[PDB]
Amino acid sequence: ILSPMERFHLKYLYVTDLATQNWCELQTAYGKELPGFLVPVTTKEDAWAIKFLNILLLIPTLQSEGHIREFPVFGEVEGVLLVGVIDELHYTAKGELELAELKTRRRPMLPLEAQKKKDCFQVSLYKYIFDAMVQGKVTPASLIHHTKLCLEKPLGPSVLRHAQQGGFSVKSLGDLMELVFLSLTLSDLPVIDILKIEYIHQETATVLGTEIVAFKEKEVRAKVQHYMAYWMGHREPQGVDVEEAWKCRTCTYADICEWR
DNA sequence: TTTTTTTTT
Ligand code: SF4
C-alpha cells in the first residue's frame, strides 16, 4: 500500500543507486531497507546552495580551461528525481565534450561483463541527466517539488561567506536557482559526445581496459522506465537471473533473500 | 540524504 520511496523515506535517488539496480534490483532494495550493513552546513537549503555555487563555478571553468572534475547533475527521470556527480568532463583536441569515468581495481583483472553493464549504464545516466540540464528540461520548480526546498528561508552565513569569496552575492536560494538555470542553458554547453570508461590497476597504473559507451537514448530511457517502476511501487523487485547466481555468493543479504 | 568509490572462496 506504500511505495518503496515512501517506505524508505527517500525524497530522490542517487545515480549509482540505479547502477546497483543494474547489478541486482533486489540487492539495491535491501540496501535501503537495512542500512546497517553496506562546507559546514546543517540544513538542506544550504547543502543545495553549495551544490549550485559549485555548478556556477565549474561552468565557466569548463568553457575556458576545457577541463573540470566533480560536476553535479540532477533532474527528474520518469517521476523520480535523480542526483549524481560526474567525475570528469573535458574537451578533446578535436572539440568534443567527453565524459571520463575512472574505475580503479586492486587486482589486475579485466572487468566482468556484468560489471561493465552496470558501469556503461551509470555513465549513460550521467549523459541522460547532463543533456537534459543544458537543454532547459530541468527547471527549478522541478527541483522544489521533489526536494521540498524552502525558498523563503534565507541562506545561512556558511553559504553567503562561501559565495562572497567567489565574487558572487547571493540574496536568496531562489535567486541562486534562477542563475543556475540560466548559466546551464545559455552558456553554449553542448551535449556529451563521448562516454569513456577506463579500468586502472591501483598500484601498477596498468590500463585494464577502455570502454567507449555506445549511447542509445531509446534503450537508456526504456531501462529507467522499468527501474523507476519499482521505486514508485508499480511492480515488485526482481533478483538476478539464474545465470548470474554467482552474485548471490558475495551478497550481504543472501541469508534473508527469498529470491535465492 | 552530503554521492560515490568498489567488489568477491
Ligand atoms: S541474494 Fe542474490 S538475488 Fe538476493 S539480493 Fe543478493 S544478489 Fe540479489
PDB file of C-alpha atoms (C1' of nucleotides) and ligand atoms in Angstrom:
ATOM      1  CA  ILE A   1       0.000   0.000   0.000  1.00  0.00           C
ATOM      2  CA  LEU A   2       3.146   2.139   0.243  1.00  0.00           C
ATOM      3  CA  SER A   3       5.771   2.691  -2.444  1.00  0.00           C
ATOM      4  CA  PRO A   4       9.468   1.992  -1.756  1.00  0.00           C
ATOM      5  CA  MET A   5      10.262   5.718  -1.933  1.00  0.00           C
ATOM      6  CA  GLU A   6       7.720   6.377   0.826  1.00  0.00           C
ATOM      7  CA  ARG A   7       8.613   3.296   2.883  1.00  0.00           C
ATOM      8  CA  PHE A   8      12.346   4.095   2.856  1.00  0.00           C
ATOM      9  CA  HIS A   9      11.768   7.860   3.342  1.00  0.00           C
ATOM     10  CA  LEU A  10      13.558   8.774   0.105  1.00  0.00           C
ATOM     11  CA  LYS A  11      12.909  12.167  -1.477  1.00  0.00           C
ATOM     12  CA  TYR A  12      15.073  11.283  -4.503  1.00  0.00           C
ATOM     13  CA  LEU A  13      17.674   8.772  -5.689  1.00  0.00           C
ATOM     14  CA  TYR A  14      21.373   8.678  -6.492  1.00  0.00           C
ATOM     15  CA  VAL A  15      22.755   7.831  -9.923  1.00  0.00           C
ATOM     16  CA  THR A  16      24.712   4.885  -8.528  1.00  0.00           C
ATOM     17  CA  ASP A  17      21.533   3.616  -6.835  1.00  0.00           C
ATOM     18  CA  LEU A  18      20.172   2.847 -10.302  1.00  0.00           C
ATOM     19  CA  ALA A  19      23.579   1.420 -11.228  1.00  0.00           C
ATOM     20  CA  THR A  20      23.384  -1.012  -8.304  1.00  0.00           C
ATOM     21  CA  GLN A  21      19.885  -1.828  -9.563  1.00  0.00           C
ATOM     22  CA  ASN A  22      21.502  -2.999 -12.802  1.00  0.00           C
ATOM     23  CA  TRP A  23      23.604  -5.385 -10.695  1.00  0.00           C
ATOM     24  CA  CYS A  24      20.635  -6.762  -8.736  1.00  0.00           C
ATOM     25  CA  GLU A  25      17.412  -4.821  -8.181  1.00  0.00           C
ATOM     26  CA  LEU A  26      16.570  -6.812  -5.041  1.00  0.00           C
ATOM     27  CA  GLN A  27      20.023  -6.159  -3.558  1.00  0.00           C
ATOM     28  CA  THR A  28      19.527  -2.416  -4.055  1.00  0.00           C
ATOM     29  CA  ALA A  29      16.165  -2.718  -2.291  1.00  0.00           C
ATOM     30  CA  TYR A  30      17.670  -4.484   0.728  1.00  0.00           C
ATOM     31  CA  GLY A  31      20.418  -1.857   0.877  1.00  0.00           C
ATOM     32  CA  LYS A  32      17.795   0.827   1.503  1.00  0.00           C
ATOM     33  CA  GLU A  33      15.700  -1.217   3.946  1.00  0.00           C
ATOM     34  CA  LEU A  34      18.608  -2.446   6.121  1.00  0.00           C
ATOM     35  CA  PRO A  35      21.333   0.239   6.016  1.00  0.00           C
ATOM     36  CA  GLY A  36      23.193  -1.275   8.986  1.00  0.00           C
ATOM     37  CA  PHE A  37      25.479  -3.148   6.591  1.00  0.00           C
ATOM     38  CA  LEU A  38      26.634  -1.658   3.259  1.00  0.00           C
ATOM     39  CA  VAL A  39      31.377  23.389   3.939  1.00  0.00           C
ATOM     40  CA  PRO A  40      29.856  23.197   7.446  1.00  0.00           C
ATOM     41  CA  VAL A  41      26.098  23.038   6.875  1.00  0.00           C
ATOM     42  CA  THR A  42      23.247  21.623   8.996  1.00  0.00           C
ATOM     43  CA  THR A  43      20.300  22.270   6.651  1.00  0.00           C
ATOM     44  CA  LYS A  44      19.287  21.197   3.167  1.00  0.00           C
ATOM     45  CA  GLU A  45      18.769  24.671   1.689  1.00  0.00           C
ATOM     46  CA  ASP A  46      22.454  25.416   2.299  1.00  0.00           C
ATOM     47  CA  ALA A  47      23.619  21.994   1.080  1.00  0.00           C
ATOM     48  CA  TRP A  48      21.802  22.510  -2.218  1.00  0.00           C
ATOM     49  CA  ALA A  49      23.048  26.109  -2.325  1.00  0.00           C
ATOM     50  CA  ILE A  50      26.647  24.881  -2.116  1.00  0.00           C
ATOM     51  CA  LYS A  51      25.938  22.453  -4.962  1.00  0.00           C
ATOM     52  CA  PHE A  52      24.582  25.350  -7.030  1.00  0.00           C
ATOM     53  CA  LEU A  53      27.579  27.567  -6.237  1.00  0.00           C
ATOM     54  CA  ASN A  54      29.950  24.842  -7.435  1.00  0.00           C
ATOM     55  CA  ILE A  55      27.952  24.495 -10.664  1.00  0.00           C
ATOM     56  CA  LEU A  56      28.175  28.249 -11.276  1.00  0.00           C
ATOM     57  CA  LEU A  57      31.965  27.934 -10.888  1.00  0.00           C
ATOM     58  CA  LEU A  58      32.548  24.801 -12.984  1.00  0.00           C
ATOM     59  CA  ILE A  59      30.540  26.027 -15.988  1.00  0.00           C
ATOM     60  CA  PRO A  60      32.948  28.914 -16.796  1.00  0.00           C
ATOM     61  CA  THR A  61      35.943  26.739 -15.891  1.00  0.00           C
ATOM     62  CA  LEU A  62      34.882  24.081 -18.399  1.00  0.00           C
ATOM     63  CA  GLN A  63      34.164  26.735 -21.048  1.00  0.00           C
ATOM     64  CA  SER A  64      37.627  28.319 -20.722  1.00  0.00           C
ATOM     65  CA  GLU A  65      40.078  25.813 -19.242  1.00  0.00           C
ATOM     66  CA  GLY A  66      38.282  22.961 -21.012  1.00  0.00           C
ATOM     67  CA  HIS A  67      38.521  20.518 -18.098  1.00  0.00           C
ATOM     68  CA  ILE A  68      36.601  20.162 -14.821  1.00  0.00           C
ATOM     69  CA  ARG A  69      36.121  17.476 -12.181  1.00  0.00           C
ATOM     70  CA  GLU A  70      33.231  16.560  -9.864  1.00  0.00           C
ATOM     71  CA  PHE A  71      30.362  18.208 -11.723  1.00  0.00           C
ATOM     72  CA  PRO A  72      26.970  17.842 -10.002  1.00  0.00           C
ATOM     73  CA  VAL A  73      23.966  16.696 -12.021  1.00  0.00           C
ATOM     74  CA  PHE A  74      20.284  16.394 -11.149  1.00  0.00           C
ATOM     75  CA  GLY A  75      16.922  16.067 -12.838  1.00  0.00           C
ATOM     76  CA  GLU A  76      13.584  14.301 -12.836  1.00  0.00           C
ATOM     77  CA  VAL A  77      13.536  10.962 -14.675  1.00  0.00           C
ATOM     78  CA  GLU A  78      10.111   9.290 -15.100  1.00  0.00           C
ATOM     79  CA  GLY A  79       8.689  10.739 -11.896  1.00  0.00           C
ATOM     80  CA  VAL A  80      11.774  10.370  -9.666  1.00  0.00           C
ATOM     81  CA  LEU A  81      14.461  12.979  -9.060  1.00  0.00           C
ATOM     82  CA  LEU A  82      17.915  11.588  -9.865  1.00  0.00           C
ATOM     83  CA  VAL A  83      21.061  13.127  -8.357  1.00  0.00           C
ATOM     84  CA  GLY A  84      24.674  12.408  -9.248  1.00  0.00           C
ATOM     85  CA  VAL A  85      28.226  13.688  -9.613  1.00  0.00           C
ATOM     86  CA  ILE A  86      30.120  13.310 -12.892  1.00  0.00           C
ATOM     87  CA  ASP A  87      33.783  12.536 -12.265  1.00  0.00           C
ATOM     88  CA  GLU A  88      35.410  14.276 -15.243  1.00  0.00           C
ATOM     89  CA  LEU A  89      34.355  16.492 -18.150  1.00  0.00           C
ATOM     90  CA  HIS A  90      36.822  17.815 -20.716  1.00  0.00           C
ATOM     91  CA  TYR A  91      37.115  18.808 -24.366  1.00  0.00           C
ATOM     92  CA  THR A  92      39.108  16.554 -26.669  1.00  0.00           C
ATOM     93  CA  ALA A  93      41.620  18.013 -29.117  1.00  0.00           C
ATOM     94  CA  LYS A  94      39.018  17.607 -31.885  1.00  0.00           C
ATOM     95  CA  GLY A  95      36.491  19.672 -29.925  1.00  0.00           C
ATOM     96  CA  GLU A  96      34.183  17.017 -28.432  1.00  0.00           C
ATOM     97  CA  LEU A  97      32.842  17.133 -24.880  1.00  0.00           C
ATOM     98  CA  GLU A  98      33.994  13.887 -23.254  1.00  0.00           C
ATOM     99  CA  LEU A  99      32.942  12.198 -20.005  1.00  0.00           C
ATOM    100  CA  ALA A 100      35.844  10.363 -18.352  1.00  0.00           C
ATOM    101  CA  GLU A 101      34.929   7.807 -15.671  1.00  0.00           C
ATOM    102  CA  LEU A 102      37.949   6.260 -13.946  1.00  0.00           C
ATOM    103  CA  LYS A 103      37.480   2.909 -12.189  1.00  0.00           C
ATOM    104  CA  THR A 104      40.416   1.669 -10.112  1.00  0.00           C
ATOM    105  CA  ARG A 105      40.817  -2.002  -9.217  1.00  0.00           C
ATOM    106  CA  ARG A 106      43.151  -3.622  -6.648  1.00  0.00           C
ATOM    107  CA  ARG A 107      43.641  -6.810  -8.658  1.00  0.00           C
ATOM    108  CA  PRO A 108      44.865  -6.503 -12.260  1.00  0.00           C
ATOM    109  CA  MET A 109      41.870  -8.312 -13.767  1.00  0.00           C
ATOM    110  CA  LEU A 110      39.687  -7.333 -16.689  1.00  0.00           C
ATOM    111  CA  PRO A 111      36.227  -6.146 -15.601  1.00  0.00           C
ATOM    112  CA  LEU A 112      33.386  -8.633 -15.792  1.00  0.00           C
ATOM    113  CA  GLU A 113      30.739  -8.152 -18.461  1.00  0.00           C
ATOM    114  CA  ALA A 114      28.183  -7.912 -15.652  1.00  0.00           C
ATOM    115  CA  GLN A 115      30.294  -5.184 -14.034  1.00  0.00           C
ATOM    116  CA  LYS A 116      30.699  -3.300 -17.315  1.00  0.00           C
ATOM    117  CA  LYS A 117      26.954  -3.261 -17.994  1.00  0.00           C
ATOM    118  CA  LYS A 118      26.423  -1.629 -14.603  1.00  0.00           C
ATOM    119  CA  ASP A 119      29.211   0.834 -15.451  1.00  0.00           C
ATOM    120  CA  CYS A 120      28.034   1.518 -19.012  1.00  0.00           C
ATOM    121  CA  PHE A 121      24.582   2.267 -17.583  1.00  0.00           C
ATOM    122  CA  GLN A 122      25.902   4.652 -14.916  1.00  0.00           C
ATOM    123  CA  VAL A 123      27.678   6.978 -17.353  1.00  0.00           C
ATOM    124  CA  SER A 124      24.696   6.789 -19.716  1.00  0.00           C
ATOM    125  CA  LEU A 125      22.603   8.138 -16.843  1.00  0.00           C
ATOM    126  CA  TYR A 126      25.143  10.943 -16.391  1.00  0.00           C
ATOM    127  CA  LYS A 127      24.679  11.897 -20.048  1.00  0.00           C
ATOM    128  CA  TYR A 128      20.901  11.430 -19.811  1.00  0.00           C
ATOM    129  CA  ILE A 129      20.808  13.981 -16.982  1.00  0.00           C
ATOM    130  CA  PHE A 130      23.500  16.326 -18.323  1.00  0.00           C
ATOM    131  CA  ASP A 131      21.896  16.667 -21.759  1.00  0.00           C
ATOM    132  CA  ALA A 132      18.599  17.499 -20.041  1.00  0.00           C
ATOM    133  CA  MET A 133      20.150  20.172 -17.807  1.00  0.00           C
ATOM    134  CA  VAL A 134      21.949  22.115 -20.558  1.00  0.00           C
ATOM    135  CA  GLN A 135      18.870  21.957 -22.819  1.00  0.00           C
ATOM    136  CA  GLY A 136      16.355  23.518 -20.420  1.00  0.00           C
ATOM    137  CA  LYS A 137      14.447  20.379 -19.401  1.00  0.00           C
ATOM    138  CA  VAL A 138      15.357  20.667 -15.688  1.00  0.00           C
ATOM    139  CA  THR A 139      13.508  23.577 -14.065  1.00  0.00           C
ATOM    140  CA  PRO A 140      13.827  24.995 -10.538  1.00  0.00           C
ATOM    141  CA  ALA A 141      10.165  24.121  -9.961  1.00  0.00           C
ATOM    142  CA  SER A 142      11.061  20.506 -10.749  1.00  0.00           C
ATOM    143  CA  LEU A 143      13.702  20.674  -8.007  1.00  0.00           C
ATOM    144  CA  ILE A 144      11.438  22.308  -5.407  1.00  0.00           C
ATOM    145  CA  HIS A 145       8.650  19.771  -5.930  1.00  0.00           C
ATOM    146  CA  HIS A 146      10.851  16.735  -5.225  1.00  0.00           C
ATOM    147  CA  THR A 147      13.298  18.083  -2.621  1.00  0.00           C
ATOM    148  CA  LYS A 148      10.796  20.357  -0.813  1.00  0.00           C
ATOM    149  CA  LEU A 149      13.353  23.160  -0.599  1.00  0.00           C
ATOM    150  CA  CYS A 150      12.038  26.183   1.304  1.00  0.00           C
ATOM    151  CA  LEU A 151      12.978  29.234  -0.759  1.00  0.00           C
ATOM    152  CA  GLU A 152      11.519  31.628   1.813  1.00  0.00           C
ATOM    153  CA  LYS A 153      14.225  30.662   4.292  1.00  0.00           C
ATOM    154  CA  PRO A 154      17.412  32.748   3.996  1.00  0.00           C
ATOM    155  CA  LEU A 155      20.719  31.001   3.436  1.00  0.00           C
ATOM    156  CA  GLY A 156      22.989  30.842   6.464  1.00  0.00           C
ATOM    157  CA  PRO A 157      26.329  32.604   6.924  1.00  0.00           C
ATOM    158  CA  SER A 158      28.076  29.402   5.823  1.00  0.00           C
ATOM    159  CA  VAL A 159      26.927  29.859   2.217  1.00  0.00           C
ATOM    160  CA  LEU A 160      26.945  33.661   1.937  1.00  0.00           C
ATOM    161  CA  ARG A 161      30.573  33.551   3.071  1.00  0.00           C
ATOM    162  CA  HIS A 162      31.499  30.858   0.532  1.00  0.00           C
ATOM    163  CA  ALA A 163      29.672  32.990  -2.057  1.00  0.00           C
ATOM    164  CA  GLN A 164      31.284  36.374  -1.368  1.00  0.00           C
ATOM    165  CA  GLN A 165      34.716  34.722  -1.531  1.00  0.00           C
ATOM    166  CA  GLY A 166      33.781  33.564  -5.042  1.00  0.00           C
ATOM    167  CA  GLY A 167      32.760  37.046  -6.169  1.00  0.00           C
ATOM    168  CA  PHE A 168      29.008  36.389  -6.360  1.00  0.00           C
ATOM    169  CA  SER A 169      26.479  37.965  -3.982  1.00  0.00           C
ATOM    170  CA  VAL A 170      23.591  35.609  -3.197  1.00  0.00           C
ATOM    171  CA  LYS A 171      20.454  37.052  -1.599  1.00  0.00           C
ATOM    172  CA  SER A 172      18.039  34.096  -1.623  1.00  0.00           C
ATOM    173  CA  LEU A 173      18.101  30.458  -2.621  1.00  0.00           C
ATOM    174  CA  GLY A 174      15.560  31.447  -5.274  1.00  0.00           C
ATOM    175  CA  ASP A 175      17.858  33.939  -6.995  1.00  0.00           C
ATOM    176  CA  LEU A 176      20.656  31.356  -6.906  1.00  0.00           C
ATOM    177  CA  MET A 177      18.493  28.751  -8.651  1.00  0.00           C
ATOM    178  CA  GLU A 178      17.474  31.131 -11.442  1.00  0.00           C
ATOM    179  CA  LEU A 179      21.113  31.921 -12.227  1.00  0.00           C
ATOM    180  CA  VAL A 180      21.940  28.198 -12.241  1.00  0.00           C
ATOM    181  CA  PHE A 181      19.163  27.570 -14.768  1.00  0.00           C
ATOM    182  CA  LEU A 182      20.333  30.445 -16.971  1.00  0.00           C
ATOM    183  CA  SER A 183      24.021  29.507 -16.762  1.00  0.00           C
ATOM    184  CA  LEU A 184      23.294  25.862 -17.598  1.00  0.00           C
ATOM    185  CA  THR A 185      21.134  26.661 -20.634  1.00  0.00           C
ATOM    186  CA  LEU A 186      22.696  29.869 -22.047  1.00  0.00           C
ATOM    187  CA  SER A 187      26.471  29.220 -21.971  1.00  0.00           C
ATOM    188  CA  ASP A 188      26.794  27.096 -25.150  1.00  0.00           C
ATOM    189  CA  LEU A 189      27.159  23.919 -23.096  1.00  0.00           C
ATOM    190  CA  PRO A 190      26.936  21.106 -25.683  1.00  0.00           C
ATOM    191  CA  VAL A 191      25.709  17.578 -25.168  1.00  0.00           C
ATOM    192  CA  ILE A 192      28.208  14.903 -24.171  1.00  0.00           C
ATOM    193  CA  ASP A 193      29.690  13.449 -27.357  1.00  0.00           C
ATOM    194  CA  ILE A 194      31.840  10.631 -25.916  1.00  0.00           C
ATOM    195  CA  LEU A 195      31.317   8.397 -22.869  1.00  0.00           C
ATOM    196  CA  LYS A 196      34.656   6.849 -21.880  1.00  0.00           C
ATOM    197  CA  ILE A 197      35.169   4.338 -19.061  1.00  0.00           C
ATOM    198  CA  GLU A 198      38.711   3.365 -18.053  1.00  0.00           C
ATOM    199  CA  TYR A 199      39.731   0.484 -15.780  1.00  0.00           C
ATOM    200  CA  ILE A 200      43.034   1.047 -13.977  1.00  0.00           C
ATOM    201  CA  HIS A 201      45.130  -1.117 -11.684  1.00  0.00           C
ATOM    202  CA  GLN A 202      45.589   0.819  -8.444  1.00  0.00           C
ATOM    203  CA  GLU A 203      49.309   0.090  -7.968  1.00  0.00           C
ATOM    204  CA  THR A 204      50.943  -0.648 -11.334  1.00  0.00           C
ATOM    205  CA  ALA A 205      48.746   2.016 -13.024  1.00  0.00           C
ATOM    206  CA  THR A 206      48.154  -0.509 -15.817  1.00  0.00           C
ATOM    207  CA  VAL A 207      45.213   0.066 -18.146  1.00  0.00           C
ATOM    208  CA  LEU A 208      42.908  -2.924 -17.649  1.00  0.00           C
ATOM    209  CA  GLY A 209      40.581  -1.913 -20.496  1.00  0.00           C
ATOM    210  CA  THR A 210      38.823   1.026 -22.136  1.00  0.00           C
ATOM    211  CA  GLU A 211      35.078   1.221 -22.785  1.00  0.00           C
ATOM    212  CA  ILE A 212      33.532   3.762 -25.157  1.00  0.00           C
ATOM    213  CA  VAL A 213      29.828   3.551 -24.347  1.00  0.00           C
ATOM    214  CA  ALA A 214      27.578   3.394 -27.410  1.00  0.00           C
ATOM    215  CA  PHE A 215      24.805   5.678 -26.174  1.00  0.00           C
ATOM    216  CA  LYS A 216      21.304   4.937 -27.488  1.00  0.00           C
ATOM    217  CA  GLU A 217      18.658   7.194 -25.959  1.00  0.00           C
ATOM    218  CA  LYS A 218      15.680   4.894 -26.561  1.00  0.00           C
ATOM    219  CA  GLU A 219      17.446   1.994 -24.833  1.00  0.00           C
ATOM    220  CA  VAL A 220      18.543   4.094 -21.846  1.00  0.00           C
ATOM    221  CA  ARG A 221      15.080   5.622 -21.426  1.00  0.00           C
ATOM    222  CA  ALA A 222      13.410   2.202 -21.576  1.00  0.00           C
ATOM    223  CA  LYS A 223      15.534   0.775 -18.756  1.00  0.00           C
ATOM    224  CA  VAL A 224      14.994   3.620 -16.282  1.00  0.00           C
ATOM    225  CA  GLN A 225      11.289   3.463 -17.111  1.00  0.00           C
ATOM    226  CA  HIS A 226      11.463  -0.155 -15.942  1.00  0.00           C
ATOM    227  CA  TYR A 227      13.725   0.654 -12.985  1.00  0.00           C
ATOM    228  CA  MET A 228      11.655   3.605 -11.747  1.00  0.00           C
ATOM    229  CA  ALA A 229       8.567   1.374 -11.951  1.00  0.00           C
ATOM    230  CA  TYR A 230       9.776  -0.411  -8.813  1.00  0.00           C
ATOM    231  CA  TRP A 231      10.642   2.741  -6.861  1.00  0.00           C
ATOM    232  CA  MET A 232       7.195   4.242  -7.459  1.00  0.00           C
ATOM    233  CA  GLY A 233       5.595   0.940  -6.425  1.00  0.00           C
ATOM    234  CA  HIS A 234       4.056  -0.312  -9.682  1.00  0.00           C
ATOM    235  CA  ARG A 235       5.827  -3.696  -9.550  1.00  0.00           C
ATOM    236  CA  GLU A 236       7.772  -5.946  -7.173  1.00  0.00           C
ATOM    237  CA  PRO A 237      11.589  -6.016  -7.086  1.00  0.00           C
ATOM    238  CA  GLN A 238      13.404  -8.704  -9.062  1.00  0.00           C
ATOM    239  CA  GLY A 239      16.573 -10.648  -8.297  1.00  0.00           C
ATOM    240  CA  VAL A 240      19.352 -11.832 -10.578  1.00  0.00           C
ATOM    241  CA  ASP A 241      18.860 -14.299 -13.401  1.00  0.00           C
ATOM    242  CA  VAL A 242      19.739 -17.936 -12.765  1.00  0.00           C
ATOM    243  CA  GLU A 243      22.830 -17.482 -14.960  1.00  0.00           C
ATOM    244  CA  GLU A 244      24.160 -14.749 -12.636  1.00  0.00           C
ATOM    245  CA  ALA A 245      23.558 -16.772  -9.458  1.00  0.00           C
ATOM    246  CA  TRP A 246      27.244 -16.266  -8.602  1.00  0.00           C
ATOM    247  CA  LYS A 247      26.339 -12.747  -7.436  1.00  0.00           C
ATOM    248  CA  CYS A 248      24.351 -14.156  -4.501  1.00  0.00           C
ATOM    249  CA  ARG A 249      27.564 -15.647  -3.077  1.00  0.00           C
ATOM    250  CA  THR A 250      29.131 -12.275  -2.189  1.00  0.00           C
ATOM    251  CA  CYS A 251      25.808 -10.593  -1.322  1.00  0.00           C
ATOM    252  CA  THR A 252      25.239  -9.346   2.229  1.00  0.00           C
ATOM    253  CA  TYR A 253      21.529 -10.250   2.154  1.00  0.00           C
ATOM    254  CA  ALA A 254      21.936 -13.809   0.841  1.00  0.00           C
ATOM    255  CA  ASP A 255      20.649 -15.331   4.101  1.00  0.00           C
ATOM    256  CA  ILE A 256      17.345 -13.397   4.065  1.00  0.00           C
ATOM    257  CA  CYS A 257      16.653 -13.087   0.330  1.00  0.00           C
ATOM    258  CA  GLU A 258      13.705 -15.286  -0.669  1.00  0.00           C
ATOM    259  CA  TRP A 259      14.588 -14.951  -4.360  1.00  0.00           C
ATOM    260  CA  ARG A 260      17.625 -17.105  -3.528  1.00  0.00           C
TER     261      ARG A 260
ATOM    262  C1'  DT B   1      20.113  12.275   2.479  1.00  0.00           C
ATOM    263  C1'  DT B   2      26.461  15.087   1.796  1.00  0.00           C
ATOM    264  C1'  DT B   3      27.248  10.938  -3.958  1.00  0.00           C
ATOM    265  C1'  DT B   4      30.444   7.744  -4.644  1.00  0.00           C
ATOM    266  C1'  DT B   5      34.296   4.544  -4.622  1.00  0.00           C
ATOM    267  C1'  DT B   6      34.354  -0.760  -5.150  1.00  0.00           C
ATOM    268  C1'  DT B   7      33.658  -5.854  -5.323  1.00  0.00           C
ATOM    269  C1'  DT B   8      34.429 -11.043  -4.453  1.00  0.00           C
ATOM    270  C1'  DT B   9      36.182 -18.965  -1.987  1.00  0.00           C
TER     271       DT B   9
HETATM  272  S1  SF4 C   1      20.996 -12.897  -2.706  1.00  0.00           S
HETATM  273 FE1  SF4 C   1      21.189 -12.697  -4.973  1.00  0.00          FE
HETATM  274  S2  SF4 C   1      19.068 -12.231  -5.677  1.00  0.00           S
HETATM  275 FE2  SF4 C   1      19.088 -11.866  -3.423  1.00  0.00          FE
HETATM  276  S3  SF4 C   1      19.555  -9.643  -3.231  1.00  0.00           S
HETATM  277 FE3  SF4 C   1      21.557 -10.723  -3.112  1.00  0.00          FE
HETATM  278  S4  SF4 C   1      22.309 -10.733  -5.269  1.00  0.00           S
HETATM  279 FE4  SF4 C   1      20.092 -10.217  -5.371  1.00  0.00          FE
END
